[PDB]
Amino acid sequence: MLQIPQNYIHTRSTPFWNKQTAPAGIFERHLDKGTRPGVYPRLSVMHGAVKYLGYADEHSAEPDQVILIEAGQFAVFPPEKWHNIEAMTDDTYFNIDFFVAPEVLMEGAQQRK
Amino acid sequence: MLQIPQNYIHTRSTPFWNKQTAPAGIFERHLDKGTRPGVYPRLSVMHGAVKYLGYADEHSAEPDQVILIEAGQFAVFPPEKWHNIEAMTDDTYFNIDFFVAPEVLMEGA
Amino acid sequence: MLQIPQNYIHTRSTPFWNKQTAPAGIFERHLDKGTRPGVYPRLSVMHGAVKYLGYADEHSAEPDQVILIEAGQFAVFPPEKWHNIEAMTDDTYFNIDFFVAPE
Amino acid sequence: MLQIPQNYIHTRSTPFWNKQTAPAGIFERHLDKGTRPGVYPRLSVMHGAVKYLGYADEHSAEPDQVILIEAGQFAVFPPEKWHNIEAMTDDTYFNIDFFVAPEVLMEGAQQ
Ligand SMILES: [Zn+2]
Ligand SMILES: [Zn+2]
Ligand SMILES: [Zn+2]
Ligand SMILES: [Zn+2]
């Protein structure tokens, strides 16, 4: 399973969504982006099941990776990778958390005058 | 398993923690600060495994609820209940997300 | 002006709301609570105008505090104080950010 | 004033920064990381005042946009534009919130 580095930071979260409430576009092929690159999405299924479908590129015809996520489980998605999800039942609902890399700026001994 | 209602709101997320970076007191029997009906914490473990032990009350000798959370899994804990977690390995790391009911986030007159 | 202490941390944000998309209960008298006491709400108006009506207590007949927040401005709401907001137009829309004391 | 469209989504919020705690790079002319159409930063001042300076390009001699932000106010800055900020006082602190269009956060495939 793909893991999010322990030093990554949580930036945003989505409300709980189901087939009807989620933005329609999440069920079609797409890329999850942020302000910066390398954002890791973490989809958690609270009930039912959710399927992740990843592709080689923006136009490949069939998925090159499939992950089934059941209630009580989560899966982090490969960054900058085209994909779409699919709800397995009408009762399925889930939410998504996004994580980004931390910034480490070198500092000096004095303050900036 | 405990499930958090669809209308609940994500209010806070703790950073990733391991045996060393997490608040020492989380491994000791405690009551989540501010816990009350409508406040559900969700613990997801990214690596290793975390064990949750729940107790009927502050001084119960044995727990009445045991949950082993592995990497790729999460568990929602019951509010207003004494408990504690335990990291099963040194490289274990998890984070906790909190969700709360709209009526308690904004209590009307 | 009421200010949020520099050491507080941002915990949550609401999407942009207007008279219709906002949760109804916000236009009615209420209290913002959050998991811990002392939370600070910061309402910023992106367009139109919002008015804050604060009250002495849960049942005061009239408000003891009034603040008009116009586009390009925000206002920090006194914690633990009952209040309700009023959008001044249909075109008005705002969002709320919440800040809490350092963990 | 620039306004962030009502359907945009809050993606990041920086902690409160002052003349010393803010990343040094924000005080010098730069181009925000990942800046592009659909990404608007919103800088609001909690105390003191902050001044934004925008430039036509990277080497323009003079700025062509100036926004003074007092405490209790905020200003949305244009995307893909060279700029820098200046804290008017030592006791000044502020924070920035970034908002992004839904079509940019979730880039739909085309054919
Ligand atoms: Zn996605
Ligand atoms: Zn706990
Ligand atoms: Zn309120
Ligand atoms: Zn900037």
Curated annotation (Swiss-Prot), chain B:
Transmembrane segments: none annotated. InterPro entries: DUF1971, RmlC-like_jellyroll, Tellurite-R_YeaR. It holds the Pfam family DUF1971. It comes from the Bacteria. This is Uncharacterized protein YeaR. The lineage of its organism: Bacteria, Pseudomonadati, Pseudomonadota, Gammaproteobacteria, Enterobacterales. The gene is yeaR.
